[PDB]
């Protein structure tokens, strides 16, 4: 087992978390493991912003390995920004450690209400170098160099709330997690984990659309026009100006997303993208889909996709591998 296993834990049964620690001593932190960003950031004791009151904060001075820096930074996400400065110290992922460069965030003001409302402390990126600020080598890519893991790849098995936890295996593929054969999809870029696939919903097809397998996104993102065309004949109710698309969970018109390559066919049925909203109305559900237009027609296969499919992100071969996750471990 020259490969880790960070037990992930469900957050409000949509997203999920996993820990890691900075500072040469322990200093544990809960992170959102983001295959959609390449920058590890942590709240510093120097944080002055309210968002930190609930967070675990980092003390460089309490850590022998702290290598200073201070280059101010601004980490921008599609959902928020977080400011701070670079610093270096050990990072203990699972049991493996390595001198890693990160960001000591001290202002979390532009990441609200998300931050104050969530239980994670930081965001640990698992993406490609070109997606990073300060050009940091990917943890898993650096670990391989550092002969700590043989294969520079990471597995993801999302926990299913009251069923089982999940795992972030680092360095190898555990069959315990997946059913059926794995199928590999070569990256179209070494940025995000972006593969190319044909999108097909009703008889709406956007062939060769960009597909970003992002674990940091709670929803399945869709090019706006696609969203607008998709929700036309269904009996879906969008509240004016709000990305709140309410359905009866039994709506027989609900489409089944279906992305395919010449290697495999991946589908996400209503069961995986719908979100029960019984408190609002009995028998009601919401889509968990968002209109979002990237420069080039992109879909974002977030938590819902990865929650059905066991995924393998391989830095060495430059591809993502999709297999069906095991309903239970």
């Amino acid at each position: 087992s020259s490969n880790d296993n960070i037990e992930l834990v469900d957050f409000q049964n949509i997203m999920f978390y996993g820990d890691a620690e900075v500072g040469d001593n322990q200093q544990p932190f809960t992170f959102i493991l983001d295959t959609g960003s390449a920058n590890l950031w942590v709240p510093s004791v120097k944080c002055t912003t309210a968002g930190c009151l609930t967070k675990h904060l980092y003390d460089s001075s309490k850590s022998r390995t702290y290598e200073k820096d201070g280059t101010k930074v601004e980490m921008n996400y599609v959902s928020g920004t977080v400011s701070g400065f670079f610093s270096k110290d050990l990072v203990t992922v699972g049991n493996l450690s390595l001198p890693y460069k990160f960001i000591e965030v001290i202002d979390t003001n532009g990441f609200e209400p998300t931050y104050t409302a969530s239980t994670f402390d930081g965001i640990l990126g698992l993406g490609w170098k070109d997606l990073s600020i300060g050009s940091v080598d990917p943890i898993v890519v650096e670990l391989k160099n550092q002969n700590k893991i043989e294969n520079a790849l990471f597995t993801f098995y999302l926990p299913v709330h009251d069923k089982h936890t999940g795992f972030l295996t680092i360095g190898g593929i555990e069959e315990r997690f997946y059913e059926g054969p794995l199928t590999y999809e070569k990256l179209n870029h070494d940025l995000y984990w972006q593969i190319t696939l044909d999108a097909h919903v009703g008889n709406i097809m956007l062939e060769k659309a960009n597909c970003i397998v992002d674990s940091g996104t709670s929803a399945i993102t869709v090019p706006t026009d696609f969203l607008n065309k998709m929700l036309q004949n269904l009996d879906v109710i969008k509240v004016p100006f709000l990305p709140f698309y309410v359905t009866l969970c039994n709506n027989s018109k609900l489409p089944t997303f279906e992305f395919t390559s010449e290697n495999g066919k991946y589908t996400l049925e209503p069961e995986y993208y719908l979100q029960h909203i019984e408190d609002v109305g009995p028998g009601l559900c919401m889509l968990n889909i968002i209109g979002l237009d990237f420069p080039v027609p992109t879909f974002i296969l977030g938590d819902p996709f990865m929650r059905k499919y066991f995924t393998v992100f391989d830095y060495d071969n430059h591809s993502v591998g999709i297999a069906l996750a095991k309903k239970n471990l």
Binding site: M15, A38, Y77, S79, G127
Partner: peptide
């Protein structure tokens, strides 16, 4: 929701 880098 949360769509995570620019």
């Amino acid at each position: 929701x949360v769509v995570x880098a620019x």
